[PDB]
Design a binder for this molecule. Sequence first.
Ligand SMILES: [Ca+2]
Lengths: 236, 238
Amino acid sequence: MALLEICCYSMECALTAQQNGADRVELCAAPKEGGLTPSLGVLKSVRQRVTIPVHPIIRPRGGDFCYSDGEFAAILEDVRTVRELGFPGLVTGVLDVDGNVDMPRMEKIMAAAGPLAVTFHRAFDMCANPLYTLNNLAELGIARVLTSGQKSDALQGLSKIMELIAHRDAPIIMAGAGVRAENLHHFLDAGVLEVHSSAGAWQASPMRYRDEYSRYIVDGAAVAEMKGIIERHQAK
Amino acid sequence: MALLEICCYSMECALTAQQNGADRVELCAAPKEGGLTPSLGVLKSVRQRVTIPVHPIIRPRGGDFCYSDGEFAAILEDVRTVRELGFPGLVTGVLDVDGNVDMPRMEKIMAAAGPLAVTFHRAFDMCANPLYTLNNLAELGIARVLTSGQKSDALQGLSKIMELIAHRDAPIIMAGAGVRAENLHHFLDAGVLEVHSSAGAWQASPMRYRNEYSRYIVDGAAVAEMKGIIERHQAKLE
Ligand SMILES: [Ca+2]
């Protein structure tokens, strides 16, 4: 059956995701930045508490993926860090100014990653040629790619995703961006092998003395609901 | 003369700040979150490339400072790690739901920090009872407090900042929020001994192809300008 990956911004989310049927978790920090590299403290906390596969994101800042040399140095050390801590995979991506995968720098990341399964994130949706990009990711040894079919949301890009899936010798295609219980069946029917969802919402701050009063948390019920949909899909 | 601290979101910013006269750097990640803990890669890079004092922020998420047990576990590990890596200080802060300093949690943070100079950040501006709080921070051994006088910007909170400074030797008061070359004199004349500035600027993305991308960087000239203002102000003192 299809693999369910949940985007998490805390160790507790990863646990809640796990307890509710998630098969994998992408670990990030800074939801308002779209996801940045977690601190060592969070990484260690996850390694001691979460058992399902966790792939931390390696992203020093928001915005584009054309990092400076300084930022890249940090990226390589963070890749080494995640590998040394024992995570089974990681999520990252570097592009050149023309919307192409930065092959030389991605090669250095792959070298540092060693045996870890590397996911190329939505930087993919910013690439000029999706097919040539898939070829490039395969050449690098990338395990999977997170994509919305190069559209605002994965559903709108589902027809493209089905085209991408038919491409031989390519990383696994994981649909992401707007995937939820309500539309999951569309991706399953399309034949998508893996799906990615934040399945979260902003929670109000418990502060009684006073956007600085809200937290981003995962909806465990939504995770459970999606896993259920996946289970029933291959049984009915 | 007053001390100039610059908020940096990268190793390159910190070095640029250092080369332009900054006395100290507060190191963070995620500017859209108001600053979160830097990744280990960034921390290690800074220890290798920057020589002026750098105080990394220890903050797992944006928003309030009433962390969960899980977030707090990470915070203590991050504090221990920053101490291990050799940083001279760090920036953090924890409050309870009523805006009081969470003493048990802060005590644990201080224990983990060892000899590091701990800055209690703008959590102070969200706390209740400023003087009582200053007393508690002194009890904890907090070295300094980053504050806007509990106002939207430090200049508005100038009078409050002065009252904090006058308060029976509380930790060092460092003015922050909207502090820049234009208004620096207000704080220096008020007797503020340490100032914190973003000295921020924006650089367009070099991206030529696209299917928001502006990078938040530091303005070296601005850092130098503020340092010059600080030097001259000190010169005025005979
Ligand atoms: Ca008071």
